[PDB]
Design an enzyme around this catalytic site. Structure first.
Site, PDB file in Angstrom:
ATOM      1  N   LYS A  36      26.506  43.828  25.182  1.00 19.61           N
ATOM      2  CA  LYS A  36      25.865  42.911  24.486  1.00 19.61           C
ATOM      3  C   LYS A  36      25.631  41.693  24.707  1.00 19.61           C
ATOM      4  O   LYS A  36      25.291  41.408  24.999  1.00 19.61           O
ATOM      5  CB  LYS A  36      26.499  43.481  23.205  1.00 19.61           C
ATOM      6  N   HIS A  53      18.624  79.335  30.769  1.00 23.41           N
ATOM      7  CA  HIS A  53      16.779  79.466  31.685  1.00 23.41           C
ATOM      8  C   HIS A  53      16.612  77.285  32.485  1.00 23.41           C
ATOM      9  O   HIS A  53      15.909  77.292  33.341  1.00 23.41           O
ATOM     10  CB  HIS A  53      15.973  79.276  30.978  1.00 23.41           C
ATOM     11  N   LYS A  94      23.162  48.856  10.160  1.00 24.04           N
ATOM     12  CA  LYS A  94      24.409  48.314   9.253  1.00 24.04           C
ATOM     13  C   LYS A  94      24.371  47.393   9.482  1.00 24.04           C
ATOM     14  O   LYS A  94      25.453  46.455   8.301  1.00 24.04           O
ATOM     15  CB  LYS A  94      26.267  49.613   9.421  1.00 24.04           C
ATOM     16  N   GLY A 145      28.824  54.231  11.796  1.00 28.25           N
ATOM     17  CA  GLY A 145      27.824  54.851  11.946  1.00 28.25           C
ATOM     18  C   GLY A 145      27.594  55.571  12.104  1.00 28.25           C
ATOM     19  O   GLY A 145      26.341  56.985  12.085  1.00 28.25           O
ATOM     20  N   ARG A 146      28.146  56.197  13.091  1.00 28.34           N
ATOM     21  CA  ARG A 146      28.254  57.575  13.287  1.00 28.34           C
ATOM     22  C   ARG A 146      29.068  58.744  12.423  1.00 28.34           C
ATOM     23  O   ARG A 146      28.754  59.451  12.975  1.00 28.34           O
ATOM     24  CB  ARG A 146      28.745  57.563  14.745  1.00 28.34           C
ATOM     25  N   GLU A 189      17.682  45.636  18.846  1.00 26.22           N
ATOM     26  CA  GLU A 189      16.295  47.216  18.722  1.00 26.22           C
ATOM     27  C   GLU A 189      15.833  47.210  18.061  1.00 26.22           C
ATOM     28  O   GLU A 189      15.021  46.561  17.761  1.00 26.22           O
ATOM     29  CB  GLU A 189      17.211  47.461  19.323  1.00 26.22           C
ATOM     30  N   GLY A 199      23.863  55.513  15.276  1.00 30.57           N
ATOM     31  CA  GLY A 199      23.998  56.035  14.059  1.00 30.57           C
ATOM     32  C   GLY A 199      23.033  55.860  12.775  1.00 30.57           C
ATOM     33  O   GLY A 199      23.036  56.553  11.546  1.00 30.57           O
ATOM     34  N   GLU A 247      31.814  58.609  20.857  1.00 30.01           N
ATOM     35  CA  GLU A 247      31.922  57.801  20.719  1.00 30.01           C
ATOM     36  C   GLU A 247      32.814  57.050  19.927  1.00 30.01           C
ATOM     37  O   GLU A 247      33.820  56.481  20.028  1.00 30.01           O
ATOM     38  CB  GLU A 247      30.666  56.159  19.833  1.00 30.01           C
ATOM     39  N   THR A 286      21.305  44.068  14.555  1.00 29.78           N
ATOM     40  CA  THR A 286      21.187  45.102  15.540  1.00 29.78           C
ATOM     41  C   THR A 286      19.628  43.943  16.425  1.00 29.78           C
ATOM     42  O   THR A 286      18.612  44.496  15.892  1.00 29.78           O
ATOM     43  CB  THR A 286      21.016  46.448  15.778  1.00 29.78           C
TER      44      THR A 286
END
Lengths: 556, 556
Positions: B518, B388, B210, B271-272, B216, B158, B357, B214
């Protein structure tokens, strides 16, 4: 339909009905200490290993035996040989299916209509390499004498997705190559925003179209040629800045492209299997010919694996068969492809065409309709990004979703003494472990209690913390994502798709389903001109056109 | 579960069972001349119109009435008011759900725990605007006195997908703004390849998280700070090049970010649903604050539409209800979002998080498990590219796939006197017309005969040319994709997702399903260090780790 009449398929379905409720991944692992050993394969390509771990799947030895027996009963091996031998297995179009010839480094003759295709495959490869050398070295000059700094591929679908996916994946190998751009949508935004960043003096356009009549591509090409000519003002300059990748010599000439600037391919190269042909020219320009040959060689390695390995230990076959189990027995509509590699960010999108345009079919070889499911909806995003987007639903939604998790052991960017990659790997491993194991009511309760939650608070939150697990995955781990390894991995999935198509008795190599929309768009195009209300279609199509005409004028 | 016990839901299901075989789009249109008029809505926002044409759906007036009665029975309106009033509808986390407050341009008080949140929402907006002015005007200088030329947002999920999707969609509005980059994956490729293109003297990093824990994001942030300090060599310089978007003041301080460089948001911003908050700072830097306020205002317009329009003519409600019909009656696992706009190339990926989510859930408000489907798998690519790639399967596969087709009437790039856009529109219209109409055996036979095919050739090819049609779509057409219109469209889908969640009795606003992975990754991380074989997990996880350790060494 052949599949539903097959006795091995019927046996598999009856077993599934009888024993489904008994299949639990956790329990399968605690009952078989050798479970990983018995439900995994390692491929040693001599340029990296590939571990295909299919042990976190809802299968037993008996299930795998039945699936292999199904492959035999449906004649997978004989069909495979027809493909490799140049027989016209694309029966609706009367064509051979020979992407394997494009990368046949062994140069054994492969005949189409009695004539070996290898000399022409190799002649085009040599032409690509010679041109690529001139461009990359700076020997090939633009109309004002400058070297080429930007290559723009104009093409859509099979003439776009492969080269874009591979150049993105092999970005570390592009030192000394020009920048590459991919323009594909007819939406004028695509070409407009690209041309705004370019100098006509140093830009080379590659017009990529199997037929050379695809509306989006030819219109984009004409727009590019007009922009180019506004600066160059000499039709002869086009020959220094435009080349064609196509099967249609005549249309290429009519477009104004120098015949020596045409890199040919053939009717037996399907667009979604075309990056190995002349269509790969932008790949070779970006990463060099040695790297492009390594990409073809990796594919060739996998072709030999697929062609000569007994079914029970044949990687594409087993991936295919696990898919048949989830599609035709469990009824899962989708298949997620989740590469834990940012360079592979367009890999799932590539296989969305490769898989869905091949096997999203419903007419069998006998001309009868299937009465069972065929190809799945393929989707995905690279890890770990997807964990923070949609994995909530994979873990705790109401859909069963087979997932393939892929990762290289070695990263192209081992920054921070490998810390980022260690975390990436830990997530790759943990996610499939989590999908399998879940977390029971009592496990979650214990955790909440240890965290100091009160009885009332625990009672309300607890149910939401439970994970049912039992969600199956494949883990595909390979030494490093080099050009060779990428070629092996792409060919592996090509062959998985082949095997599924033979089992379903459909034609993986035509695409009649795109025709109707093309036909209807040609009828609507002229109706959009002018202010007149349109009444020639159904009320919705008419209403939408009339709204478009009303709003064309609005000033917002 | 509440939904399956609801008498209106039971009535809908029984009608579906009784009358399903009778639903055919072609026939519905020839029986009702006013079908488009009766099954479409036009929204006039004063800054563009939105036509929501839902007439190509397998519904009759009776079906729509029953669906509206279901929304009433499930208490959609009262739930909606609880959301807008700041009640703690995110019941598992004990939080309000107030992305609507972030864009409440009317400034009516909205209370959380008795306290109006509007003053703080507006204080942060004013802080964002002041900072944005300094950066864009060149008043804010880097450590060597240069203006900022590059803004790098570091965040995932998010904290990434919204700002990236919106800056991509609003690229034409970025004149005079710095370049923006989005780094999100922990994969070290992402930050490494980004930093290689930057000058520390002119680059501003935005750390978006947030929680500010986190893994990452914080690891990426630390890698960026280390790279920055290698050049600047003065911890005080960090304050000129790093800002934070977060709810956690304490962790931001501990990271080394100047407290005046923190742009706050709140626990009631999921977050989203966060791009409307401080998380949108990179949007405002790229396109300017006026454009960011227009984006918020479009969302506010749609919030007022959703809040005050009777259900039977309420766009998010009707989109939601059509989804309930396809999910819970027809059993379709997926929902495709297909914007015919290259600028919207990351729109479907954004809603993959927003929708999946939120509604990929299985525990109801009563703490019981659902015994029916919840959220679908969302996927898509922009038109015409998808035609295509995967439309073959949409037209001629074995899956039923509700699709939303979206397009602006007016293009941002009307090149070639509008030719590209005319073709784009013609395809947008033709595809849904084709999906509805199909092509019968006799129609296809007539075509093949007129094309001069022989009897033997026709007989074999004919079956593959048939299209069954009856494939339902929504067409959403809007005047132009401006900041305001994009804000209205995103809010429309936010509210669709809300309505579906209330009908299913699930919590659209938590995400407990990401926790297990996690947890398990933290356990595996240290096990990857060293040469020792790991035996602490199931045989697959162990086998994969051991292969990783074996291959870490390989030289390929």
């Amino acid at each position: 339909a052949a599949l539903t009449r097959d006795p091995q398929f019927q046996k598999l379905q009856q077993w599934y009905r009888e024993h489904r409720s008994e299949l639990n991944l956790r329990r399968l692992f605690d009952a078989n200490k050798d479970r990983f050993n018995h439900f995994s394969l390692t491929l040693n390509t001599n340029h990296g290993h590939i571990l295909v771990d299919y042990s976190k799947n809802l299968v037993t030895e008996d299930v795998m035996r039945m699936l292999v027996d199904l492959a035999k009963s449906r004649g997978v091996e004989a069909a495979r040989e027809r493909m490799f031998n140049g027989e016209k297995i694309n029966y609706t179009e009367g064509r051979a299916v020979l992407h394997v010839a494009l990368r046949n480094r062994s140069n054994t003759p492969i005949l189409v209509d009695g004539k070996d295709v290898m000399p022409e495959v190799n002649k085009v490869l040599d032409k690509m390499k010679s041109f690529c050398q001139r461009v990359r070295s700076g020997d090939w000059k633009g109309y004002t004498g400058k070297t080429i700094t930007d290559v723009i591929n104009i093409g859509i679908g099979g003439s776009d997705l492969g080269p874009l996916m591979v150049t993105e994946a092999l970005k570390p190998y592009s030192s000394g190559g020009p920048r590459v751009w991919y323009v594909s949508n007819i939406d004028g935004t695509h070409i407009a925003k690209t041309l705004a960043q370019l100098n006509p003096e140093s830009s080379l356009f590659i017009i990529a179209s199997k037929t050379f009549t695809t509306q989006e591509t030819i219109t984009n090409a004409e727009t590019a040629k007009e922009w180019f000519l506004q600066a160059a003002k000499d039709p002869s300059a086009v020959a220094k800045h435009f080349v064609a990748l196509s099967t249609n010599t005549t249309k290429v000439k009519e477009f104004g492209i120098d015949p020596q600037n045409m890199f040919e391919f053939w009717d037996w190269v399907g667009g979604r299997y075309s990056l190995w042909s002349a269509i790969g020219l932008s790949i070779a320009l970006h990463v060099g010919f040695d790297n492009f040959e390594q990409l073809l060689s990796g594919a060739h390695w996998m072709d030999q694996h697929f062609r000569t390995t007994p079914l029970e230990k044949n990687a594409p076959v087993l991936l295919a068969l696990l898919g048949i189990w989830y599609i035709n027995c469990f009824g899962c509509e989708t298949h997620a492809m989740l590469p834990y590699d940012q360079y592979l960010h367009r890999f799932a999108a590539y296989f969305q065409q490769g898989d869905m345009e091949s096997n999203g079919k419903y007419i069998t070889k006998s001309g009868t309709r299937v009465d069972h499911q065929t190809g799945p909806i393929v989707w995905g995003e690279p890890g770990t990004n997807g964990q923070h987007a949609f994995y909530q639903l994979i873990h705790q939604g109401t859909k069963m979703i087979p997932c393939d998790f892929l990762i290289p052991v070695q990263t192209q960017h081992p920054i921070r003494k490998g810390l980022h990659h260690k975390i990436l790997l830990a997530n790759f491993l943990a996610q499939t472990e989590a999908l399998m194991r879940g977390k029971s009511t009592e496990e979650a309760r214990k955790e909440l209690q240890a965290a100091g939650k009160s009885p009332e608070d625990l009672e309300r939150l607890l149910p939401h913390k439970v994970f049912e697990g039992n969600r199956p995955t494949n883990s595909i781990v390979f030494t490093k994502l080099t050009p060779f390894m990428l070629g092996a991995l792409v060919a592996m999935y090509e062959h998985k798709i082949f095997v599924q198509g033979i089992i379903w008795d459909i034609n993986s190599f035509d695409q009649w389903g795109v025709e109707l929309g093309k036909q209807l768009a040609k009828k609507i195009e002229p109706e959009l001109d002018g202010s007149a209300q349109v009444t020639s279609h159904d009320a919705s199509t008419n209403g939408l056109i009339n709204f478009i005409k009303q709003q064309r004028e609005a000033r917002v």
